[PDB]
Each structure stands twice: as C-alpha cells, then as structure tokens.
C-alpha cells in the first residue's frame, strides 16, 4: 500500500479532523505536517459538550471547561508507516514540528507532554492567556 509513497503525511485526514478547530491552531498544526518525521494525523479536534460531559463523569477530566469545546485544543495521533502507535518517542518528535511551526507562526502552543504531571504525548492547545475563551 505505501511502497511508493516516498513522503508519508496524512494530509487529508488531519484536516479533515482540523475543521471547526481555531484557524491559528490549524495553521501551525498544518505546518507541522510538513516539518514532523513521524506521520499523524488529528485524531480529535473539536470536542461536543457531551462527550466532555461523559469524561468528567468517569473521571477523566475534573471539568466541562476544556479547550477542545471551543476550538482551542487538537489530540495527535502518531501514524509511523500507517501504524497507529501509542509510543512516546513519537510525539516527542511531532511536538519538535509543532514547536518549530508555532514559533514561526508567532504563537505559543502548549504541550500535554510538558504538563506538570501525568504528561501525555497527543494534546496541543492555544494558551488561555494568549487566546481567551
Ligand atoms: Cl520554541
Ligand atoms: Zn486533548
């Protein structure tokens, strides 16, 4: 399937996915597709009320207040070959693209792997103090 594909980027499902999120998040992250040497793509980007709703009732989030109800927030997943892979190298690497993109955007973009605890590799925002909601 992907003998010939020179470049692996998955363009088209990460935009896909990218529709509704802010237009400067988008752009970084579609930035970074073309910088990262770990395929991905967006696995969630704009999050329903219910669905934010139903992780605070099992207890993965404490609030309804999240960046990803707005707009503000993207969850990455690393695609090596096609693969889904959960590993943490790779999203170290994706966010050296995401970084890199930022920067060049003029925006800061937050990292879940530079969470003060229980760091976690897919999750990029906008800033609250840079982009209120
Ligand atoms: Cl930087
Ligand atoms: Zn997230």
Redesign the pocket.
């Known amino acids: 399937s992907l003998n010939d594909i020179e470049e692996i980027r998955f363009t088209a499902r990460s935009e896909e996915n990218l529709r509704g999120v802010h237009p400067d998040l988008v752009r970084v992250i579609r930035l970074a597709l073309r910088y990262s040497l770990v395929p991905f793509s967006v696995s ?1 980007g704009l ?1 329903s009320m219910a669905r934010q709703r139903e992780m605070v009732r099992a207890g993965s989030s404490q609030t309804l207040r ?3 109800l707005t707009g503000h ?3 990455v997943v690393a695609m090596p070959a096609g693969v889904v892979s959960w590993e943490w190298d790779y999203y170290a690497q994706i966010a050296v693209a995401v970084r890199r993109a930022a920067r060049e955007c003029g925006i800061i973009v937050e990292w ?1 792997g530079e969470w003060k605890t229980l760091k ?1 590799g ?4 906008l800033t609250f103090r840079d982009y209120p909601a």
Do not use: I
């Open positions: 969630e999050r999240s960046r990803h927030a993207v969850d879940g976690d897919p999750h990029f925002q």
